[PDB]
Structure formats: C-alpha cells, structure tokens
Design a binder for these strands. Structure first.
Lengths: 80, 223, 141, 129, 203, 100, 82, 126
RNA sequence: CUUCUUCACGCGAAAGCUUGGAGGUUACAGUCUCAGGGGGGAGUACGUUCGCAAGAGUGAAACUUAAAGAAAUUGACGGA
RNA sequence: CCUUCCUCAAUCAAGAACCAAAGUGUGGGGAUCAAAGAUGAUUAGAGACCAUUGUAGUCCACACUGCAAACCAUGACACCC
RNA sequence: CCCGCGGUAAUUCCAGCUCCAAAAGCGUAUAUUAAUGCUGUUGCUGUUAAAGGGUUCGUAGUUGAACUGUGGGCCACGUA
C-alpha cells in the first residue's frame, strides 16, 4: 500500500467488485468485466466504455442482473 | 511439450511476452488452467518450488487396497504469490508432478503486512485471518521484523517461499490431520487478499482485458 | 414465550399515533369529566368504562381527551376502583375456577389455569405492594 | 428477550452488511446507540443515518456502504485504563492500526484509539473494524 | 439516436411474434418484471424494461472486438436458425442444443473457446453453460421468460419464448439495433433480413 | 447411521403428540397409522367371461353401481409389506417426496 | 432484494401492504364513522370496531352487533366517514 | 446379437459419408463396393458392413433415417429460408394505431409526450 | 401447522441442518438455565435420602483398560 | 378493537404442580385380547419362534407411582436472515 | 515410553562394527508446568460422536428496554 515511508509497497493493488465493492479476490470465476461501449448519436464510441469488474455472488443472487440493473440505473443507458 | 504451446490465449499472450505477471491475472480477474502460464511467466532461478507431502491413497476394493499416492507441491516465490498442489498418482513421483502442476496452477496473490504499523516493507500478514479445515483451525495474526512465530513448522516453509517472516499465530486443532492442515493453510493463504481494506482500496479504476486487448492478436497466429 | 403459551397472541389495538385528537372534533375536560362520571357512576370497571366508552361514547383514548389516563382522574376525583383491576379479572375467574374446580373430579386444566393465574395474582399483587398500593400486609387467598 | 438493542443491532447490522442490506430502519433507538453509530459513520464505514420519530422509542434509518468488516458488543462492559487498551485491541482488531474499539466515557462514548489519544479510561462497549 | 424508444411498428413486431405474455398465470416473480396476472397461464411482462435491457445488451455487444467471441446459445428448436442468422451476420459463436461440457472446463478439448461472453436463452436448459460461465468469470445475457430462472444470467431479456416467431423475432429485432451501432445499418432501413428466415425448422 | 428423518411419523412439526396405533391386519403387531402406507382402493370382481356368464345372467341393473365391486382399505407396514414385495428403500430422495 | 424504492418510503404499493403493528408506525387501524338511524333525524358517532353497542336515542335500540372485527352495522342504518 | 458393432455401423455409415450416394440397396454390389472403397481386412466385416449398407440405405431410401444425411436438404432449407416476400407476418397486423393495454399505452404516452390515446389493458383479466 | 418448493451463504466431519434450522461464531461474546466432560469399572455400591410398593431421588472410589465412539466412502456380503 | 393499566418483566436453585406403559394397594370389573400357566407341534435341543388355548393383567371405579428410543434423540428466551 | 521387534538370512532383540544424539554431563524416579481454549473468562462441549429434564409452576439466583443524558449562539477568516 504505502510503507513506513509512505509509498506503495507490495504487489497488486487489488480489484474491487464494481457493483458492491466488496473486494475482488483472485479466484472469482463468476465475476465479470463488462466494458460497455457508450453510445453516441447513432453509434457508439468506444474507448469509452463504462467499465466494471463485478463479483460472482450476485449471479447466484439474481442480482447479477438485478443489482447490476440498479447499478446500471445509477449509470443509465437507454432510459425513459 | 517442452515447447509447450500455451494454448490458452493468455498463455499465448504471455508466452508471447505480453503481460507476464500473475498480478495481471489477478488484476485482470483471470483464471488459468494451463500450468505453463505461470511457469512461463515467472521462473527466475529458484523460485521456491517445492514438494511437501507424500501420502498413500486406498480404495478398498475386492482384490485391492487400491493404492495410489497423493503428493503435495507448494510453489511459491518469496513475495506475493504462492501456488498450491496436491495431486494423486499411481506413481508417487507422478503424484508430485501432478501436484506440481496443481502447484503451478493454484497461485494466489498475497497482500502482506507488517504489524504495529508500516516499516520499510511488509513481512507479515496484514491482518489477523483464519483457515479452518475438517478438524483444523489457524488464525494468523500480525507480527513484526524479528519473529519466530507461533505454531506449526509445516506451513512455515511455504510462508517463507511466499515472502513473509513475522506474523503471530494461534493454531488450534488436529495437527494430527496434516493433509487438511495444509488445505487450511492454503485457504488461509487465500484469505491473503481478504478483508475490505481501508488501507489502499479507494477506487479500483478499470483495467480492460489484457487478453481481449490483444483480441485480434489473439485471433492471429490463432484463428 | 407467552407466559402460559407456546404460541403467540399478537392481537392488538394500534394506539392513536395522533395524540392530537381527532380530525373532527374537540370536547372539554368538563365534558370528559361529565362523561366519565356518568359512566363511572354507571359502574364499569374503568378499563371497562374505557372500552365501553370507546365504542359507546364514541369518543376515544382517555389519555388524550384530557391529558391524563382515566384511573388517576378517577382516583383524584374520588372514583377510584377498589383495586388493581387486572388482578381482579383474573381473580374473579380464579375464584370462579376454584368453584368449578370444586365441582370437578380431575380437571388438570383448571388446576393449570388456576396455578398460572394465582401466581400471576401473586406477581401483580406483589407488584402493587412493590408500587406501594397494595395495601400493605396484603394477599389473596 | 434481550436488552441491548444496540447489541441486536450489531449482529443484525453485520448481517446487513454481509448480504448487503444497504439501509435499515431499526427499531427503536435510545440515546446511546446513536452516539456509537455516529462514530462508525465518522470513520468511513457506513454511510449516514437519519433518526425517525415515534411517539415511543425512535426508529432510525441507516446508511451503509460496504466498509464494515466486523462490529461487536461486549457483554459485560469493562474498565479501561492503560494496558487493557493494549489487550483489547490486540484481541479484536485484525491489525493494530485499523478498526476502532469503543468504550463509554466521561468524555462521552468514544473509541479507544482516540481514547488512547485522550488519555482517559472508562468502560468498554464494543468495536468495529 | 439520441432517442431509443420503441416505435409502433416495433411494438407491432413485438406483440406479433408473441413474446409478451407470461408463463403460468403468475410465474417467478423473482422475475417480477411483470405487472398483470394474465389469464390462461400468463402475465403482462412489462415491456419497458425489456427494451431497456435489450439496448443495453447491444451496448455491451458493441464492445466486442471479436464479435465471434460473443457466444450465442439455443436449446430450443425454435432458436437455432435464428441464432445463426444472428451469427452469420454477426459472426457469433453459436451453441445449438445439448451442450456437452468440457468446453472451457477443458481447454484441452477441441471445443475450447474462450470468449468474453455467452448469451443464453433457455437458462433452464442451458445450465452447463451457465455453469461454464460460472467457472470462468463469464457473464451471460439471456432471453428469460417469467419463471425462466435468471441465476447467473446477468442481464435478463424479459421474453416470452414460445417458439414460432417469438424467439426469433426477438432475436432478430435485437440484432437490428446492434447493427445500427457496430455495423452501420441505418434505422429506416428494412433491415433486409426477416424473421421468416430467422425463424425455425422446416417442414 | 440414520436413514430417513420423519422415520415414518408425519407429526414432528405439527400437533399430534401421539397418534393411532392399529394391529396391522396382516401380521398384526400394533402400529401408528402414518408409519403404515395406505392405499385404500375399491376392488374388481370376476374374470371376463365369468362375468359374461354372469352378464347374460345379469338380471341386475342400476342404483349408483351397475354391477357393484369390492373395496379394500389397504394399509401396509414393514411386517407384511416386506414379503409382499411392498414398501422398501427406493432411491434416496423419493423416501422424502409424495405421489401424484 | 431491496433497491429502487426506499424502505423509508413507500409509495403507491407500498403502504397498502404493511400490516398493522408493522405499519412503519402502527396507527389505529379501525376508525370511526357517523351513522344515522332511519329511526330518527338524528345520528350517532360510531366505532368501526365496537365490541358492544350504539343505541339510537331517537328510540333506545341498537344498530349494530358486537362481533370481533368490524362491527355488524345493520337494519338500514346509514353511515358515512371522517 | 445381430447388432451391427460400432465399428461396423461406423464403417457402413462412413462409406456413404465419404463415398456419397451411389450404391444399391442390394447387398451384392454394396458388398463389392465394401471391397472397393475401403482397404479393409476381413471379408465378413466387409459383408456385414455391406449388409448394413444395404440396410441403411434401405431405410435412407425411405428417409433421412435417425442421425443421417446427404446435404441437399439442407441446401433446400437454406433455399427455403427465403419466405420473406411471400410472407409478411408483419403488417398482416390489422391496426397501426393499435387495440391494446393501458399502461403500456400510458408509458408509451409519457414517452410520446402527451399524445392523445385511449389507455385500456389487455382486458382487465387473469 | 406447515408441508415444503426452494433458497440463503451459513453452519457442519458428514450425515446433515429453518419460522425466527444445528444458520447469522475460534472474526470465537444477546439472557437465563440445565447437562456434559477417555473408555471400562457402575450409575454401583447396606452410600444416603423419597417412596405403600415397585423402585425412584440422589450417587462413588477400588478395580480395569487403548480404545470406545461418529459419519461418510469403497469394498464384502445377505436366510435382502 | 383507539379498552384500560406503566413495567409490570425474563429466565430460573430450592421448593412446588403435572408425567404414557406397566406395575402397586383398595374396589369395581368379566367380554375380549391375552403376561402366568397348559396344551400341541417342533426341534438337535427348545417349556422357543410358530400353533391351540388359556391364568394374571387388560377396561373401569379408586388410589398411588415414578421409572417410559415419554423423539422436533435438538433448554428456554431473543433478533434477523 | 507408546506404536512394536523377535519363531533366523530380524530394520528396533544378541554381540560387533559403523554410525547417531547430547555431553562432562547424562540416565532414572516421582511429582509438577505446558502442550490443554484436552475444564475453556479469553476459549470447549451437549441432533447422530460426552451432554438440554417427559412436563410445568416457582422464591432463591441472575438478567433485565426506551425516555427528561444533549450544548447553543455568533463572529472572523482561511479553507476543498
């Protein structure tokens, strides 16, 4: 993280569950990284993705859709 | 092969000298399968590749105590990563070797720590955390730069191979049950990235598929 | 868990959350006094008045309608009940139950039910004494 | 039943984190609980809460985020004074450096680290990490 | 677009393929994206969401460098042709029928592919795959009906899938948009391709 | 080791502290009604042509039963069941899940 | 699940469903009504939960019965509400 | 067991598979065929293959027997995908301005900014 | 009262484990309480107290011993 | 139920009040089922299974008892999933 | 020590040799301390492995909820 002198010290500044943000570990095999390509008018611009890496559990929970659905609500795509 | 084609694209990309680091897997969230990927990625001299346990396995069965060997390889290198193997084989060595691959495969990132507070660098666990197993209990506790550490010989070797020196231990359980002990240990070792830190965390910025960042490249010399 | 019962009695009336009664009409303390007395003279147990009142008068929550609770008023107004009425209600049964029990042969229920109540009777009275309104040196028998 | 609602609240709270119930309206507060809730909130663990009225003991609506690792209550409460700060902390914080232990003070309901810093002993309530 | 709200023609299409009334009169309201217990084993499935999901599906579809590595699946007879028709067009990797695993559970079987993603359509029938997604950190978008379990399909496409044109239409319709994005198909296109060939099985 | 939870008795959750034992009509040691399976059935009479003989000789009509039939309230438990190739360890899970 | 909503605020579904002493705050579930005896041009305050009676006093008689829930209005007694 | 072994079945199959069509339903030429299109070992095995080849054809002769084909059908289907202009299963649809559900019309209306319509469910009915 | 679909991680050695399971605990800590604490000897002994009377209540050491147990697993086997 | 009443409680040694079977005393009680027994039969033995009965019991009045794989082998109370 | 050697081509017995370990100390005994959170405040147990009574009341015992504790105001500026 930072060491007695400050300073990052030690490897791998971890992932985090881009929904719950619970930490993402290293053996999550139901976690996924969506980079979702942004629209422009008529298209999409890409380079610009909203990007997430999200843990497995929710997938177990129906909140892989759903929670992300809120999350995605909090990031709106095509909406009313 | 000795010229193991790393048939994963990752192992490809990797073999193909892009992204050779564990962390890139861990970071990128990646899983593995292909053993050479690591074995490729990191292999600088001694790493601290090890066989640990050597067990007979039986299925009793009419005309047979069907005997097999289970063997444990721990793979590690002295800071941040360990790689676990148990494997069984009908030949002992084979079990080792089988375990070797599992050992390669079962690599984990180790968030180390100190104790009290930071010193020049960590060398401890960064937390007090626990591995439990059938009859096993250790909780591994933060110590500082000069500890002989509580508990078992057995993991200790590994710990060293993964890069930590001083952590406190409370071991509780059927040491009796050494196979499990290591399994517990590994598990413990796995929670070496557990706990919501208040200590870096902040926000993880995105990092996009380093694999699918070379998708086309991965689709070239490759379909 | 319930002190004579494995199951649960939630039941309940839900208190006037609104303490400011009642979205249609105020009354005076004189009225309430008037009422009370009229009823109390009519002889319900206060609780019983209260109940009764609640429908019958069709004016509600005694504590609200003058900022009180009946019993103290009554008390002050010299129309206290004789006793701690719940202990009574229990007693009146209990008594009855002894009588029934007296008729009976074998009924373990009347014993059970009696026990609990009598105990309860004790608790409550012990309680009244605890709140110094048992008459001192007092028991049920 | 049980007494220390604060305590019920912690186990329950914990569960709330754990599966991600991200708001709760707890039934039904005292003076006490709140001071404690505030500390955690001060310490970047949950979000913010809002106290609801009732005509009888309040309800509180609680904001959480995903930062609590564990929140305890200690029954019984215990004196605190010097060394005992060392021991408790050692006991319960995954490393001495993060987490808070809270005891109840003269100076108010308060964490131990700060307490260590305030140099006052008092009685021990619980902890969060 | 700008605007991504449904047209009466789109609407026409949708109701027509007959994708929009639920399964059982109530269903799993874990998928409570209905509102309306509807006679004879159905509900209204609120479309809005559906839509919102679909376009999203595209927003993420449009990320894939290799659209082939967007992997399609169909165990319903009623889905294969269609998936191809999307696939031919998209280049997807398709998965008809009985999956049979080892696929990315084994990298050592021929099968082996390693996409970013899989899209499932009969979650239910398609469990191995889900399981596969679950092995490898993969998410799976999916055509879900109202009791069509959604575990480990992330991003549900509320969708009655009773064969015929339902499935296929939906799929085709879906496509139209992704195509508007990556692919350049303009909107007041026909979008040439038709459910008629998205369709299914003959004769 | 233990093999079947309710162990026949269908009363743990509920309210039926202890319940009706019966001699089981086939062996006849006394037993509680829910550790015996029941399939109280009506029962058929005659073969085809003996019935045909009886049918022609059926100078018998209607009343809600146009030729009548038997009825056996059948209740089997270990004792008799066994021999009668009736009730035993199926495969696992059906030892917990009811008929349709 | 628990996202879009608020536990704190219910809305359009969401009050109707909470039950009595787990209405976010309990509140007298029953209520009072105004009732008229056709018996007279004069009328009465009533409990929608009564356990006893109303007498009309345009003629001493009772317009409802004690029964557990909502009390039984009867007889062409007309009521409105508050 | 006049079970055509796996190896057999595979072979009899395979010969039509690589060596499309031709044959007979007759064993005899199909026999000769077995000799001729493989480089097989024992006669028996060829004949057996043959017997089945006659067989498989004999029911292929009446179908695309369970699991089996010749690839044309497919290219008909391919050429039957093509029902487009002979079908509009679309705007067969009998109303552009629509006979439909309330709210659905309503979300649509708010979405269609105050546009004037009658908002009525599919029925009311479950 | 469910059953119990079905879900929950969780908990568990498993077997298995709901209402508000054996869950939410060595990340050990809501209260109250009973009990338990190798095995065997012995739950016994004139040990002792209820009890009409059974016998209950209460309740040992000597002596002895390396296990005893548990679940699963596979196997073997069955007058299955 | 908008009734009153203000912690009233909680759980709990001692201590009380219950506890199926069966037994046990004092009386019913008589039919049966059937411990005791008796008979067969069987057996290698067999007074055992098995049969055929059949005595006490059984039901009950009335007492008394305390032991019941007296099993949700799962103290209670709590708040959640 | 305890696991066990030993009926002869024994790895543990006999002797030899070699070796080893610790060492001028070392064997032993008995006890005692930890190991043992294997009596547990920390930190055990008690569904099948020890253990929650057949059942209830119940003084003793313990345990026991909220609430009137609180600060406030103002100013200054800087200041994210």
């Amino acid at each position: 993280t930072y060491n007695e002198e400050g300073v990052n010290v030690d490897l791998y500044i971890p992932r985090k569950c881009h929904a719950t943000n619970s930490l993402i570990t290293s053996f999550d095999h139901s976690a996924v990284q969506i980079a979702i390509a942004n629209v422009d008018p008529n298209g999409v611009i890409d380079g610009t993705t909203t990007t997430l890496c999200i843990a497995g559990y929710l997938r177990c929970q129906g909140e892989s859709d759903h929670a992300i659905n809120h999350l995605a609500i909090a990031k709106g795509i095509v909406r009313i | 092969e000795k010229e193991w084609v790393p048939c994963t694209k990752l192992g490809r990309l990797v073999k193909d000298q892009k992204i050779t680091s564990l962390e890139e897997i861990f970071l990128f969230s990646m899983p593995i399968k292909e053993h050479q990927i690591v074995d490729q990625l990191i292999r600088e001299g001694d790493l601290r590749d090890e066989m640990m346990l050597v067990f007979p396995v039986q299925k009793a069965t009419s005309a047979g105590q069907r005997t097999r060997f289970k063997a444990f390889n721990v793979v590690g290198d002295g800071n941040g990563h360990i790689g676990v193997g148990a494997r069984v084989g009908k030949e002992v060595s084979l079990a080792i070797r089988a375990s070797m691959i599992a050992a390669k495969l079962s690599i984990v990132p180790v968030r180390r720590g100190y104790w009290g507070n930071k010193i020049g660098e960590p060398h401890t666990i960064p937390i007090k955390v626990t591995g439990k197993c059938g009859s096993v209990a250790v909780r591994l506790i933060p110590a500082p730069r000069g500890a002989g550490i509580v508990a078992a010989p057995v993991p200790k070797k590994i710990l060293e191979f993964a890069g930590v020196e001083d952590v406190y231990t409370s071991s509780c359980g059927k040491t009796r049950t050494r196979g499990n002990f290591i399994m517990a240990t590994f598990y413990a070792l796995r929670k070496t990235y557990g706990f919501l830190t208040p200590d870096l965390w902040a926000e993880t910025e995105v990092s996009r598929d380093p694999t699918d960042e070379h998708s086309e490249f991965l689709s070239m010399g490759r379909k | 868990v319930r002190m004579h019962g494995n199951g649960h009695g939630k039941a309940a009336s839900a208190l006037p959350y609104r303490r400011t009664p009642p979205t249609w009409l105020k009354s005076s303390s004189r009225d309430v006094i008037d009422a009370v007395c009229k009823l109390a003279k009519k002889g319900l147990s206060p609780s019983r008045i209260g109940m009764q009142l609640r429908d019958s008068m069709g004016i509600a929550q005694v504590k609200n309608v003058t900022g009180r609770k009946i019993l103290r008023i009554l008390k002050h107004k010299g129309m206290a009940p004789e006793i701690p009425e719940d202990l009574y209600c229990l007693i009146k049964r209990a008594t009855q139950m002894r009588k029934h029990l007296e008729r009976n042969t074998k009924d373990k229920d009347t014993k059970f039910r009696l026990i609990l109540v009598e105990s309860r009777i004790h608790r409550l009275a012990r309680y009244y004494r605890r709140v110094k309104q048992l008459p001192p040196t007092w028991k049920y028998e | 039943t049980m007494m220390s609602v604060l305590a019920n609240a912690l186990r329950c709270i914990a569960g709330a984190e754990r599966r991600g119930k991200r708001q709760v309206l707890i039934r039904p507060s005292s003076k006490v609980v709140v001071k404690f809730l505030q500390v955690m909130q001060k310490h970047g663990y949950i979000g913010e809460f809002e106290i609801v009225d009732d005509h009888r003991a309040g309800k509180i609506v609680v904001n959480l985020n995903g930062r609590l690792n564990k929140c305890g209550a200690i029954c019984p409460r215990f004196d605190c004074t010097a060394r005992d700060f060392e021991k408790w902390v050692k006991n319960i914080l995954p490393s001495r450096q993060f987490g808070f232990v809270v005891l109840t003070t003269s100076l108010g309901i308060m964490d131990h680290e700060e307490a260590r810093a305030r140099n006052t002993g008092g009685k021990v309530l619980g902890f969060f990490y | 677009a700008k605007v991504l709200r449904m047209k009466e023609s789109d609407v026409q299409k949708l109701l027509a393929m007959h994708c929009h009334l639920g399964t059982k009169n109530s269903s799993s309201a874990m998928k409570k994206y209905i509102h309306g217990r509807t006679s004879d084993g159905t509900n209204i499935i609120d479309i809005h969401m559906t839509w919102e999901k679909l376009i999203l599906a595209a927003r993420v579809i449009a990320a894939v460098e290799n659209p082939q590595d967007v992997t399609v699946c169909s165990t319903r007879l009623f889905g294969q042709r269609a998936i191809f028709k999307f696939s031919q067009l998209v280049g997807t990797s398709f998965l008809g029928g009985r999956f049979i695993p080892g696929t990315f559970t084994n990298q050592i079987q021929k099968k082996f592919m390693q996409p970013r993603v899989l899209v499932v359509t009969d979650p239910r029938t398609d469990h191995q795959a889900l399981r596969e997604a679950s092995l490898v950190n993969i998410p799976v978008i999916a055509f879900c009906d109202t009791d069509a379990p959604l575990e480990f399909v992330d991003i549900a496409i509320p969708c009655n899938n009773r064969g015929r044109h339902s499935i296929s239409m939906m799929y085709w319709l879906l496509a139209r948009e992704v195509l508007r994005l990556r692919g350049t198909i303009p909107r007041s296109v026909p979008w040439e391709v038709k459910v008629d060939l998205f369709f299914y099985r003959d004769p | 080791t233990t093999k079947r939870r309710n162990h026949g008795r269908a009363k743990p959750p509920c309210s039926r502290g202890r319940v009706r034992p019966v001699h089981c009509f086939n062996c006849s040691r006394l037993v509680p009604k829910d550790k015996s399976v029941g399939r109280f059935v009506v029962r058929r009479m005659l073969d085809q042509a003996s019935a045909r003989d009886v049918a022609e000789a059926s100078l018998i009509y209607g009343s809600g039963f146009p030729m009548p039939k038997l009825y056996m309230k059948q209740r089997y438990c270990i004792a008799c069941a066994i021999h009668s190739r009736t009730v035993r360890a199926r495969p696992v899970e059906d030892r917990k899940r009811r008929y349709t | 699940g628990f996202f879009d909503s608020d536990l704190s605020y219910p809305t359009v579904r969401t009050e109707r469903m909470k039950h009595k002493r787990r209405r976010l705050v309990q509140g007298p579930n029953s209520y009072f009504m105004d009732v008229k005896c056709p018996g007279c041009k004069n009328i009465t305050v009533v409990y929608s939960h009564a356990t006893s009676e109303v007498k009309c006093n345009g003629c001493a008689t009772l317009l409802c019965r004690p029964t557990g829930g909502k009390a039984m209005l009867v007889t062409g007694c007309g009521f409105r509400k508050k | 067991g006049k079970i055509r072994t796996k190896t057999v079945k595979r072979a009899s199959k395979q010969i039509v598979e690589k060596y499309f069509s031709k044959l007979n339903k007759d064993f005899y030429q199909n026999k000769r065929i077995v000799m001729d299109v493989t480089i097989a070992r024992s006669k028996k095995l060829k004949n057996k293959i043959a017997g089945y080849a006659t067989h498989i054809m004999k029911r292929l002769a009446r179908g695309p027997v369970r699991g089996i084909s010749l690839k044309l059908q497919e290219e008909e289907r391919e050429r039957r995908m093509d029902y487009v202009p002979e079908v509009s299963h679309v705007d067969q649809a009998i109303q552009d301005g629509i006979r439909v559900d309330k709210q659905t019309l309503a979300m649509l209306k708010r979405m269609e900014t105050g546009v004037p319509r009658h908002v009525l469910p599919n029925v009311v009915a479950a």
